[PDB]
Design a protein around this ligand. Structure first.
Ligand SMILES: *Cc1c(COP(=O)(O)O)cnc(C)c1O
Ligand SMILES: *Cc1c(COP(=O)(O)O)cnc(C)c1O
Ligand SMILES: *Cc1c(COP(=O)(O)O)cnc(C)c1O
Ligand SMILES: *Cc1c(COP(=O)(O)O)cnc(C)c1O
Ligand code: NA
Ligand code: NA
Ligand code: NA
Ligand code: NA
Ligand code: NA
Ligand code: NA
Ligand code: NA
Ligand code: NA
Lengths: 380, 380, 380, 380
């Protein structure tokens, strides 16, 4: 029924054989056949299918209201599998500020195989319509994006993609299926880096893909089985386990996010704040219309690099590390950690200033997170 | 010094911090940084590098006398990573009977990205010289091959590849680094499905790649980090653990292989036997010159399909399952399980007759394996 | 600072060596010594100490405001270790309705070793004072108890134990350290079956013990190392991981508990309800004074056995299984599952009627749990 | 049939449900019941029984030709469980040089519970007959013992135990079931620290117990379920996995042991050598009669402490660590590491001289181990 119940009871995460209330870990590569071609439960070779991986695939298919799930060894392996639905000469549209690893994959790997890439500002969906070529086959959208949390209208992107015969894809990592369900809005394929919120505990690298389209699912299964970027059984088990508390974790994160944003907007040492919950944020009404909560990623401007580093050193509960979606609150400086190969002038033009801080809110006590960050800002 | 010692002490498989005599399992995605960019031990994000995966990478680099190791989520993910060293328009030569999954990957995935594929009979290396085009960039060799155990001259293939400016690659799965070291013979890249002998226990799906070439290693690392088919830490740990007994397991397997072949050649219900240890086998002297033991895969002909199935049902210690390299002895019928989409007439022409049986010898007692298979053959 | 923050940042759960933000899994039995007796980080043999187990021990010591933690292979192994602080001839006082496994251990195992056991109704603490003999050495209290949730005054029990020279022990399983901290009230030893709420996910069997007493800690460490009921590293890791969400899970559980109790008290098919939050419950004010939340275990009476079974069959979200503290809501019938060896007449006298149902509230949506149970009760 | 085959195919180590060729890891605490008391496959609570633990229990029962297996969280937890078959006032006979942890348990823990302990030199079995009291209930034998490898006649001990109504117990750790089967010789209970050879890889702490006696098995199961020192599922899985190569590992170890002993006996810097394979060793013919191979533990005398430490520093392939039975060869000095609390004069009297070295032979190449140790001895 309701979402928190669906997280516990949706998907197949018990053992039919023994009744075990958690998914067994099938640390196995192959399976006894009673006769040639006769499989007991449909398993014959773990790269093709493994029952622990099937459990996590059924969870992601259920949570996104799809019919088919796929579990990959990382988020970028999920993205690579989806991009391999195309051939040389095909063209894909992505939002201009897509995740750095996606950018790297498309422009440094798949362009050598004749995939053509166009980055457009999808916050205005008519941009997509202008960029469509006769060879365009895929539309790939992240919303909200990193690190400035730009919002793209999912339902209009789905309509444009249907009209022009495109496979539509949404990277739903930042929102999770708890708050945003692209397949319900007409999107063909939804994917996640489960390394972040879904696993939730900073201890699994994994990607997840869901679809409702039988034929796209067939093509994805073929690509998974031939290029072999499969998630292993132990990581599948830890993913299933982490997803159980997704609802609780996202709601705690959202409570802290609201309070932290009030604090950041009131503080003298903070300039602009980027987050889709701010009413002045571009496409705020679009976000509210397609999601019913918020990501825990917030970006905000302090004066300069030295202020950003002082902020990191003065906080007690914000940890300096890469990734996001942990139970710990994480802090980072994009201009130094993810955008440092961009020339400084272009960085400044795109909004990645030297004092742009990104925090990923965790599940610590709201008042501790607000107070800690405020007292650190006070030292500037 | 000697090989069995190198299996135990080669590579880095202890913990420098606590002294733990086995590699810790770093079930983690990210790492504390003391200052922005300052990494304690060089780790920052597990997709890029994880200390358990690094341990298994150092083992495979040591065992193959290379300098760089890479661990992938499966054998075909290793092969896909290596093939992505090429661009559209590039051409690769493979042996004609390469593994079915490699065939599938090249001709159903990478040809859609403009990679051109030519299959040649590499048992005569001048075949390679005839097939070389101006666009050829890679030579990819399995030796011995599946299921007829055709042998290709590794050192001459390396020389041809150097002469014509080609990246040379050997799939060394069947022999393992215990018996055959392609990098010592001039090959650029060696790879393995560690799902088979290296893991040794039918419980990990994994691929491993080693090279001595700094720049190829750089390109492989970039591809691994951008397409993300990484082996997880638990599977890396189980791989490191399984490799410890590789020498013992391969020597037991080889003792049984010799005795089983004597039995098969003497038996009236058995026609041809395929294995590189038979002196009448094509390129037997080449195999003896580049390897110092034998794979545990044997193929042999019985009369027909019904005889093959009766053989499977009458054996007590040969298990019907896919894969090879287990501690259990495995049995299968290629014409029904791996080549069943080939038309029957072409199957017969290539040697995949309806009574072709493939066994993968395990580590059971030699006399039990010989006696069990002989008494099963006696029922024909 | 606050409890939800302490759950994330208390204890040592990162790797000092690599910076990994989660505790490495030291799947290892022994450790390199640089010289005889010179240990790198103090480890020499995993039964004596293992770094993953040390991580979970430091978490439980921190959460209970103790100084020493101990991790055992199960809750009853923790209890057995604590009972082995006594000698033959020593006498221990327990509350009369202590957990069945504790009862079994004391009266069927440790009485054969000369430990003398007296069960008393500790809801009136002067009962304890009457039962104290010259040979009494230990006072062992569960509060609240199973399945009728009887409450015992912890601080008065601690005072009585100090006055008469007794080791005081509280089984704090039902409340968890999130809501009740016996060591803060003068108790010598606190213990838990971490199989329940602390692990939280129905996937680890484990016990945890904390103390602030150096000499009791020394004796516990000696007993642990000599009788060897240690928790393994993988289970320690999963425990540390599950504890991160303890605060979120307990607060969700408490919201549902309050609403479910309102429903149960209003329903015509339900007679008595047992839970310390009910103001008419014995020692309700004592519970409120020593805890600041509630267990998720509730017991209530329906008419008879057939009604209880119909209740189980009509619910969609209450699962029939043993244990408690899962993310799933669990349901059971004590008279049939935990007290079925007691004669029926004594069962009825102690309150374990044939229609006594026990539910363990999970983290599903509150409205789904209330509605599901109410509609099941309506079918009676 | 033969032993190496039995290691692969004995016991239940596949999944009946999916056909998985390895035992699934049931990381679970509890199990769905279809109706109250109706268990799908007999499981209801993992402390009582877990399917991965059952798999390893069936392996040890098969390998020792028993009917019931039990898996404990460590070797000393297995020993404690067996000792808890007795009551206060009962008396147990052990060999005088029993393992230090067993000694510690009996004389520092179980004597406080009224168990009476007598240590006797069981190398002459009439010693046992002299020590039998009217209260004696158990005879507990290690053969061969640590560190001087004293041999006790198992079959005569079984006969004495039957004659006088005693439970007979053999700690079979050093020999493993591959070479010595006490239950075949009339012993009631056999136990192992699986931390050593059975796991084989220095990565599991575990104990294993087998018996053929239904009523002793019932009592052991009750003790296991009430005191709760159970092995966890991941450690059970790693045990099952390690046991597969036990035969191969023990045979390699035995080849190296024979050659190393020839070298040690010829070397001028080495005085006495202790190992049951030496024909002048006490009860050599008894060992040959009850076992058909040898332990990998060897002890030998050098001049003094400084020589022992120089030996440790000069070896390349002998690792200084505690435990034994690894794939790595291990070295230690008992007088400094296991007997350092004994006064020096009593140490010298019992044979634990300051230059007594103990090595545990691993599976490195025989010639490397012989040459390395000989060249280290040459530096004295
Ligand atoms: C509640 C629930 C649903 C509801 O799905 P929606 O389409 O979001 O309404 C589905 N499956 C399960 C198992 C549920 O518990
Ligand atoms: C024995 C040994 C070697 C030997 O390497 P080769 O090139 O095969 O001679 C290398 N490394 C280690 C750790 C060894 O033990
Ligand atoms: C908040 C916090 C505490 C506070 O402990 P109390 O005694 O409950 O106030 C202790 N340790 C850590 C790491 C904390 O974050
Ligand atoms: C070979 C074998 C046996 C033989 O047992 P013994 O009593 O030692 O002869 C038993 N079980 C299995 C499964 C075997 O393979
Ligand atoms: Na992929
Ligand atoms: Na659709
Ligand atoms: Na790959
Ligand atoms: Na080279
Ligand atoms: Na214990
Ligand atoms: Na105190
Ligand atoms: Na025990
Ligand atoms: Na017997």
């Amino acid at each position: 029924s309701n979402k928190k119940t669906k997280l516990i009871h949706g998907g197949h995460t018990t053992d039919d054989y023994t009744g075990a209330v958690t998914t067994p870990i099938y640390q196995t590569s192959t399976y006894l056949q009673d006769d040639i071609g006769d499989l007991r439960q449909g398993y014959e070779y773990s790269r093709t299918a493994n029952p622990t991986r099937s459990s996590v695939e059924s969870v992601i298919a259920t949570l996104e209201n799809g019919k088919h799930g796929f579990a990959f060894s990382s988020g970028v392996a999920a993205i690579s599998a989806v991009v391999m639905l195309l051939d040389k000469g095909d063209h894909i549209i992505l939002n201009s500020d897509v995740y750095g690893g996606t950018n790297r994959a498309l422009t440094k790997v798949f362009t050598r195989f004749g995939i053509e890439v166009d980055f457009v500002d999808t916050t205005h969906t008519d941009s997509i319509v202008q960029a469509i070529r006769p060879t365009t086959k895929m539309l790939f959208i992240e919303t909200p994006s990193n690190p400035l949390l730009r919002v793209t209208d999912i339902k209009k992107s789905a309509e444009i993609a249907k009209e022009h015969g495109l496979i539509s894809v949404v990277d739903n990592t930042f929102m999770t299926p708890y708050y945003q369900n692209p397949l319900d809005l007409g999107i063909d394929i939804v994917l996640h880096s489960a390394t972040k919120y879904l696993g939730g505990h900073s201890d699994v690298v994994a990607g997840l893909v869901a679809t409702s389209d039988d034929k796209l699912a067939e093509r994805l299964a073929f690509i998974s089985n031939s290029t072999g970027g499969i998630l292993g059984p132990q990581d599948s088990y830890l993913l299933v386990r982490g997803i159980k508390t997704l609802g609780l974790r996202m709601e705690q994160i959202n409570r802290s996010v609201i309070e932290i944003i009030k604090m950041l907007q009131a503080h003298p040492a903070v300039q602009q704040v980027f987050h889709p919950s701010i009413e002045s944020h571009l496409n705020h009404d679009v976000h509210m219309a397609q999601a019913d909560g918020h990501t825990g990623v917030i970006a905000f401007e302090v004066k300069n690099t030295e202020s950003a580093k002082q902020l990191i050193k003065a906080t007690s509960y914000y940890t300096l590390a890469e990734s996001l979606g942990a139970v710990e609150s994480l802090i980072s400086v994009p201009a130094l950690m993810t955008h440092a190969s961009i020339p400084a002038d272009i960085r400044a033009k795109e909004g990645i200033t030297d004092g742009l801080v990104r925090i990923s809110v965790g599940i610590e006590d709201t008042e501790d997170l607000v107070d800690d960050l405020k007292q650190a800002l006070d030292t500037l």
